[PDB]
RNA sequence: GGGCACUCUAACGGGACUGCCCGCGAAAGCGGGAGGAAGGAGGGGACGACGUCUGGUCAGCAUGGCCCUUACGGCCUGGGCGACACACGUGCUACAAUGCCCACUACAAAGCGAUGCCACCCGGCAACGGGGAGCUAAUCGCAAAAAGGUGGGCCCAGUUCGGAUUGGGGUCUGCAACCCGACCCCAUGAAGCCGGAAUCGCUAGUAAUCGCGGAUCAGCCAUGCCGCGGUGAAUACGUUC
C-alpha cells in the first residue's frame, strides 16, 4: 500500500474544505469526487458527499473509520443478485 | 589507436573496411586486420494479419555487423590523408587512442 | 490474402532498399519519419513529373535525396528554378543540409509503379479497365521486356458487384529470387469507390 | 473519435504518466514501437517496401 | 512448489528473491 | 493438550509438529526452539518435561494463538462489515476480496457450484 | 609431442589434446570424473581410444565450453578420435564404423509461430 | 505410416553392461528425460537384487524378460457388424516392448517405497514366475488362445 | 612478456552432383556398398498456385454514400471494459518418494542496457533503500541459469504433499494502488488421492521436463506471445475404420 516515506497523501483540496469547518464552523454537506484520498482525522463528524461516478452518497465518518479511502464507502456497483 | 566502423550493410560495412587497411598501410606503418564485432540482432515480431489471427505473423531483423580498426605504428600522413576518405554511406565510424 | 511482398521479398537479393543510411538508437526513430516526410511532399510536387522512387542517404547533418522520373524536365523548371525552389521549403522542414539529385529514367514504361500509375489514371478517365490493363503489359513486353502482369480489383466498371479483373503475358514467376520483378501498386480515387491498382515487371534474372 | 486522441497525445502531459505512445504516421493505439514511432501494421508495410533502414525479414 | 512462495523453487518460478531465495 | 491450547502430535519433530498449532508456524517454529535452544530434530515425543514447559511457555508469552487468534481477525473483519467498506461487502456477501475474479475461478469462497 | 583435436556436440564445443600419460585426464582444471561427478554417460566419450586399446596409453588436457554436459562429453568423445587419426591415419578404421570419428548435426528446431514449441500445437475444441 | 516399414532405433549400448537391452529399459525408466536419475534407479535395483540373490543380475533380468515375453496377444477385428479380438503372433519388437511395459508398469504398481526397490523385485519374480508382470501375459496369451476360433481372420 | 595455434567471432569460398561399384532396369529410378563431418530434398526455415469460403477487418489507414452539426463533435473529475446464482475454450500448479525442503558444487544460449544495465560496500528476516565503481558497451552489467550433482531431513499423513483463501505488517512505482498494481514477511492452509460421457499434441533432438531473453512497459495483475538453449524417450504391424 501507499508508502510510509510518502506521507498520507490527500487531494489537500479536500483538505482544505474540511478544516476549515473544523474551526470556523463544521459542518456542512460536502461532495467530493475525493476517493484516493484516505479519510481524515479533521474529518469525521462531517457529510462528504462523496462521489462515485453518478452520485454523491453522504457517509458520515466516525472513530471506526479513517485509515481507509472515500473510495472504500461509496460503492460504485449495485448489485442486488442475479434472477 | 583505435578505429570503429559500424553499419546495416555487411558489404559495405566490409568494402569500407579495406580502404582504410589499404590506405594507411600504404603510408604506414602497422595495422590490425579488421576484426568483424559479431552483430546485435535487433529482431521485430508483427502478425502479418492487421487483425486477429495470432497464428500468422511475419519476423523482421535489425543487423548492426560492427567492424573495428586500429594503426599500430600510426604516422600523421595517415592521419591527414585519412580525413580526406569517399567512405561509402551505411555506415558510422569512430576512433580512438 | 496470401502473397508475400516483392519488395521485401527482394531486398539485398535482388533489389536495394531506398533510403540508405545507419542511425543509432537515438535518431533513427526521428530519421524515419524526417525521410517519410519527405516523400510525402516529393510523391505530391512530382506527382505530375513522374516519380518512380526517391532513395534517400545520410550521413553527418546533411542528407542525401535521389530522384528518378522519366521526365525531369517538369521537376526542374526553367534553368533549375522548380527544381532551385525545391531547395529552400525542403530544409524549411527537414531543416539539414539537403541535395536533390533528378536521375534520368532510360525507359519509364519498364517501371511497374510508373507503368500502374498510368492506367490508374486511364480507369478515373472512364476509359476501358479491361482494355488499358492488357494494353499496357504489350506496351511492357514491347519494351523488350520478357514478363509483366496488371492486377485490377473493385467495383470495376461502376458496378456495385466488385470483381477483380487482371491480364499477364510472358514469365512472372513469384518464386524466382534470381529475378528481377520490378513492383508498384497505384491507386485510383473515383466518385463511385476506389480501385487497388497492382502491376508487377519482370526484368530479368542475373 | 480520432484525430482530437492524435493531437492530445502530441501536446505535453499534464502529468507523465498520460504521455502515451502513438504512431506517428498511422496513429494506431496499440502494437507500436519506439524504436521507429510506428505501429507493428506500418512496421509490415515500410518494412516489405524495405523504406526500413538495416531492417529485413527474418529466416533461419 | 512452483505455485508455493515460501519456497525458493516457488520464488525462482516468478522470479523474485526474498527470505528463502537470497541474493 | 501437553502444548499451550492444544495436543501436538508425537513422533514427529518438535519444530515441525507445532505447525498444527494456530498461529504457529514454521516461521514460529525455529524462534521458541532458538529461544528455548531445544534442537528441532528431537522428536516431541523424545523432549524433556522441562523443554516442554520452556517450549511450552516462552510460545505462551509472545504472541496470540487458536482461539484467542481467532478472536482477532474476526472482529477486524466484523468491523468492516459494520462501516461496510468494499472489503465488508466482499465479506458481507463471501465475494473475493483482494481484487481477484469473479465471473469465474473464486470457487473457494464461493464453495462448490450452485445450480440454476 | 602432442595431439589435440577438437569435437562439438550441440552448443558444446571441446578441445581436446592427447598427451602420452598414464591414463590421467585433465578437463577444464579438475580430474575427468571429478568434473563428472555422476553421469553416466561418462565413460561414453572415453569410448574412442578404448576402440583402439588407447585408454592406458596416455593422458589428454581437455577444455569444454557450450551448452551443458550432455553436448560437452559427446563434444569430447568426438575430438579424441579426431585425434587418433593425426596419431594414425589409419585408425579411421575402428572408428569410423563405430561412428565415433563423426559428428551428428541432431540439433534444435527453432520454436515456430502459432505452434507452443518447434512442434507441439495448442489444443483446440472443434465444435 | 502409409509409405514403406519404418525403421528400428537401434539404441547405444549401456556403459555399464554393454547391453542395448538395459540402454532400453532405462528409457521407460528414464521419466521427463532424467537419464541419471533413470539410470540409478535400475543400476541401483541392480544391487539390492544382487544382494538378496548372488547370481549376476545380467542374467537376472535377461531371464525375467523372457518369462515376460508374451508369445501370442489378441487385436481386434470389426469384420462385419461386429468387432472379433483376432489374436495374433506377436511382434520380436513388440514382445521386447511388451515386456518392458509391464515390469515397470507392474513395478510401479509395487506397494515398497523406493524406486530402485520396487523395479528390481519385479526383476527377480519373473526370473522365478511371480507377479503381475506375468499376469499380462498370462491372462494376454489365452484369451487369444481363449479366441483360437478367429486365426483364420488373422493377417 | 607475447603469441593467432585453438576456442570464438563475420565476411568470401569448397562442399552432395545419385557424380563411382554390384544390382533389377527400356529409359526414368529403386535396393545395397564403399568413400565423406554429412547421401539420395541433409535437418529446419522464410517462399502460399486460378482459385473457394458474398471468410475477417469502415475499431490502423484509405475510400464509396448515408447519417450527427452548441453535437452522434471536444477537454475534464468520477466511473465501467476486473460485475457474477451459471455454461464452454486456452493455460499455471498440482494431487507426490523416479517426490518436498535446507545448504553446498558446475554446465547454455539468443538477447537487452545511458533520468538504461547496476558492480562492490552497508542498513533490514526481507521486498527494497542508500552510497557508490564500470559500461556510448566481444571490455562493463542484467547474471544466478534450472533441471543435475554431493550431503542431511521428511517414512506414506490431505503430510515438511498443494499454496487457493483470509487477517496482519510494509515496500516500489505512480499525482494519485478504494473498487484496481505487483514484490517482500507472519499466521491461517481450502478444494485435489490421476478425474464421467467426450477430446488434444507430437514421428527425433521431436514429445517430456528444466529454466533463461526480448518486444509491448512508469509499475503491471504475463501461467501470455514471440525466441533462447539444457536433459532427454516410446512407437509406427499395417490402411479396415
Ligand atoms: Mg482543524
Ligand atoms: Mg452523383
Ligand atoms: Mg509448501
Ligand atoms: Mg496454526
Ligand atoms: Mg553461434
Ligand atoms: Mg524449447
Ligand atoms: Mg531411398
Ligand atoms: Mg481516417
Ligand atoms: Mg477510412
Ligand atoms: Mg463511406
Ligand atoms: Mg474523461
Ligand atoms: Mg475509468
Ligand atoms: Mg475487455
Ligand atoms: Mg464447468
Ligand atoms: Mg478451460
Ligand atoms: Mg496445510
Ligand atoms: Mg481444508
Ligand atoms: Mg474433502
Ligand atoms: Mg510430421
Ligand atoms: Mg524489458
Ligand atoms: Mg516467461
Same mark, same amino acid.
Given at each position: 500500500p501507499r508508502s510510509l516515506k510518502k506521507g498520507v497523501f490527500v487531494d489537500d483540496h479536500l483538505l482544505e474544505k474540511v478544516l476549515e469547518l473544523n474551526a470556523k464552523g463544521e459542518k456542512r454537506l460536502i461532495k467530493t469526487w475525493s476517493r484516493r484520498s484516505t479519510i481524515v482525522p479533521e474529518m469525521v463528524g462531517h457529510t462528504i458527499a462523496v462521489y462515485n461516478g453518478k452520485q454523491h452518497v453522504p457517509v458520515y465518518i466516525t472513530e471506526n473509520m479513517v485509515g481507509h479511502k472515500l473510495g472504500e464507502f461509496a460503492p460504485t456497483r449495485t448489485y442486488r443478485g442475479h434472477g | 589507436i583505435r578505429i570503429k566502423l559500424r553499419g546495416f550493410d555487411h558489404k559495405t560495412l566490409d568494402a569500407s573496411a579495406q580502404k582504410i587497411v589499404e590506405a594507411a598501410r600504404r603510408s604506414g606503418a602497422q595495422v590490425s586486420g579488421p576484426i568483424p564485432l559479431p552483430t546485435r540482432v535487433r529482431r521485430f515480431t508483427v502478425i502479418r494479419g492487421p487483425f486477429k489471427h495470432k497464428d500468422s505473423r511475419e519476423h523482421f531483423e535489425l543487423r548492426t555487423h560492427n567492424r573495428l580498426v586500429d594503426i599500430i605504428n600510426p604516422n600523421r600522413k595517415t592521419i591527414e590523408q585519412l580525413m580526406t576518405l569517399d567512405l561509402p554511406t551505411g555506415v558510422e565510424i569512430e576512433i580512438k587512442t | 490474402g496470401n502473397k508475400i511482398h516483392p519488395i521485401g521479398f527482394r531486398l539485398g537479393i535482388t533489389r536495394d532498399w531506398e533510403s540508405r543510411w545507419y542511425a543509432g538508437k537515438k535518431q533513427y526513430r526521428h530519421l524515419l519519419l524526417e525521410d517519410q516526410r519527405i516523400r510525402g511532399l516529393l510523391e505530391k510536387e512530382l506527382y505530375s513529373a513522374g516519380l518512380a522512387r526517391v532513395d534517400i542517404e545520410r550521413a553527418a547533418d546533411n542528407v542525401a535525396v535521389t530522384v528518378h522520373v522519366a521526365k525531369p524536365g517538369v521537376v526542374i523548371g526553367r534553368g533549375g528554378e522548380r527544381i532551385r525552389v525545391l531547395r529552400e521549403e525542403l530544409a524549411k522542414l527537414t531543416g539539414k543540409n539537403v541535395a536533390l539529385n533528378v536521375q534520368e529514367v532510360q525507359n519509364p514504361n519498364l517501371s511497374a509503379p510508373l507503368v500502374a500509375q498510368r492506367v490508374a489514371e486511364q480507369i478515373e478517365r472512364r476509359f476501358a479497365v479491361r482494355r488499358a490493363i492488357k494494353q499496357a503489359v504489350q506496351r511492357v513486353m514491347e519494351s523488350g521486356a520478357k514478363g509483366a502482369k496488371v492486377i485490377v480489383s473493385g467495383?470495376?466498371?461502376? #458496378?456495385?458487384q466488385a470483381r477483380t479483373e487482371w491480364a499477364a503475358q510472358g514469365r512472372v514467376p513469384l518464386h524466382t529470387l534470381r529475378a528481377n520483378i520490378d513492383y508498384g501498386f497505384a491507386l485510383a480515387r473515383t466518385t463511385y469507390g476506389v480501385l487497388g491498382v497492382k502491376a508487377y515487371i519482370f526484368l530479368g534474372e542475373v | 473519435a480520432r484525430k482530437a486522441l492524435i493531437e492530445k497525445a502530441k501536446r505535453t502531459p499534464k502529468f507523465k504518466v498520460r504521455a502515451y505512445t502513438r504512431c506517428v504516421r498511422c496513429g494506431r493505439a496499440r502494437s507500436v514501437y519506439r524504436f521507429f514511432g510506428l505501429c507493428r501494421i506500418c512496421l509490415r508495410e515500410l518494412a516489405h517496401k524495405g523504406q526500413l533502414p538495416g531492417v529485413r525479414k527474418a529466416s533461419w | 512448489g512452483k505455485g508455493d512462495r515460501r519456497t525458493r523453487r516457488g520464488k525462482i518460478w516468478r522470479g523474485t528473491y526474498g527470505k528463502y531465495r537470497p541474493r | 493438550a501437553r502444548i499451550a491450547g492444544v495436543e501436538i502430535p508425537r513422533n514427529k519433530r518438535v519444530d515441525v509438529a507445532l505447525t498444527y498449532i494456530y498461529g504457529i508456524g514454521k516461521a514460529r517454529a525455529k524462534e521458541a526452539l532458538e529461544k528455548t535452544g531445544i534442537n528441532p530434530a528431537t522428536r516431541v515425543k523424545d523432549l524433556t518435561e522441562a523443554e516442554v514447559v520452556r517450549l511450552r511457555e516462552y510460545v505462551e508469552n509472545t504472541w496470540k494463538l487458536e482461539g484467542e487468534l481467532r478472536a482477532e481477525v474476526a472482529a477486524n473483519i466484523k468491523r468492516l462489515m459494520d462501516i461496510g467498506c468494499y472489503r465488508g461487502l466482499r465479506h458481507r456477501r463471501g465475494l473475493?476480496?483482494?481484487?481477484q475474479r469473479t465471473r469465474?475461478? #473464486?470457487?473457494?469462497?464461493?464453495?462448490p457450484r450452485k445450480t440454476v | 609431442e602432442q595431439y589435440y583435436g577438437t569435437g562439438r556436440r550441440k552448443e558444446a564445443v571441446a578441445r581436446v589434446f592427447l598427451r602420452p600419460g598414464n591414463g590421467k585426464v585433465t578437463v577444464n582444471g579438475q580430474d575427468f570424473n571429478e568434473y563428472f561427478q555422476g553421469l553416466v554417460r561418462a565413460v561414453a566419450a572415453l569410448e574412442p581410444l578404448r576402440a583402439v586399446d588407447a585408454l592406458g596409453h596416455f593422458d589428454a588436457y581437455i577444455t569444454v565450453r557450450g551448452g551443458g554436459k550432455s553436448g560437452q562429453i559427446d563434444a569430447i568423445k568426438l575430438g579424441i578420435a579426431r585425434a587418433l587419426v593425426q596419431y594414425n591415419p589409419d585408425y579411421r578404421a575402428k572408428l569410423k564404423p563405430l561412428g565415433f570419428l563423426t559428428r551428428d548435426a541432431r540439433v534444435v528446431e527453432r520454436k515456430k509461430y502459432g505452434k507452443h514449441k518447434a512442434r507441439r500445437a495448442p489444443q483446440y475444441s472443434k465444435r | 505410416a502409409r509409405r514403406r516399414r519404418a525403421e528400428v532405433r537401434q539404441l547405444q549400448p549401456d556403459l555399464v553392461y554393454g547391453d542395448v537391452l538395459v540402454t532400453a529399459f532405462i528409457n521407460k525408466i528414464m521419466r521427463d528425460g532424467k537419464k541419471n536419475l533413470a539410470a540409478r534407479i535400475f543400476y541401483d535395483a541392480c544391487k539390492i537384487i544382487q544382494e538378496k540373490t548372488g547370481q549376476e543380475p545380467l542374467k537376472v533380468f535377461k531371464q525375467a524378460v523372457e518369462n515376460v515375453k508374451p508369445r501370442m496377444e489378441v487385436r481386434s477385428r470389426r469384420v462385419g457388424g461386429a468387432n472379433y479380438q483376432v489374436p495374433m503372433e506377436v511382434s520380436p519388437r513388440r514382445q521386447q516392448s511388451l515386456a518392458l511395459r509391464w515390469l515397470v508398469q507392474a513395478a510401479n504398481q509395487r506397494p515398497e517405497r523406493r524406486a530402485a526397490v520396487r523395479i528390481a523385485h519385479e526383476l527377480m519374480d519373473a526370473a522365478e514366475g511371480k507377479g503381475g508382470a506375468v499376469k499380462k501375459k498370462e491372462d494376454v496369451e489365452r484369451m487369444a488362445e481363449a479366441n483360437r476360433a478367429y486365426a483364420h481372420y488373422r493377417w
Open positions: - | - | 467495383r470495376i466498371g461502376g #458496378a456495385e | - | - | 473475493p476480496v483482494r481484487g469465474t475461478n #473464486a470457487r473457494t469462497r464461493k464453495g | - | -
